[PDB]
Amino acid sequence: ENPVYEKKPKREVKKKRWNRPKMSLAQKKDRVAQKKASFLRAQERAA
């Protein structure tokens, strides 16, 4: 009788982000620097 499809009406939604974005080169570079400082810092404490 009526096979047509009435598309569900789109609604504007609050812009929300549900997953992390890629870490930047600077952040990835700093993290290595922080990790290296932490490793030696621990080694000095042990001694």
Q: Which residue type does 27 have? A: Q
Q: Report d(CA 47, CA 42) in Å as an integer.
A: 9
Least CB distance from residue 47 to RNA, whole Å? 12
| Residue number with CB closer to RNA (2 or 24) | 24
Mark 23-43 as b/e (b = at least 16 C-beta within 10 Å).
eeeeeeeeeeeeeeeeeeeee
Select from 3, 5, 6, 42 the one that contacts RNA (CB under 7 A). 42
Select from 3, 13, 20, 44 the one that contacts RNA (CB under 7 A). 20
Applying CB under 7 A, the residues found at the interface with RNA are: 20-21, 23-24, 26-27, 30-31, 34-35, 37-39, 41-43
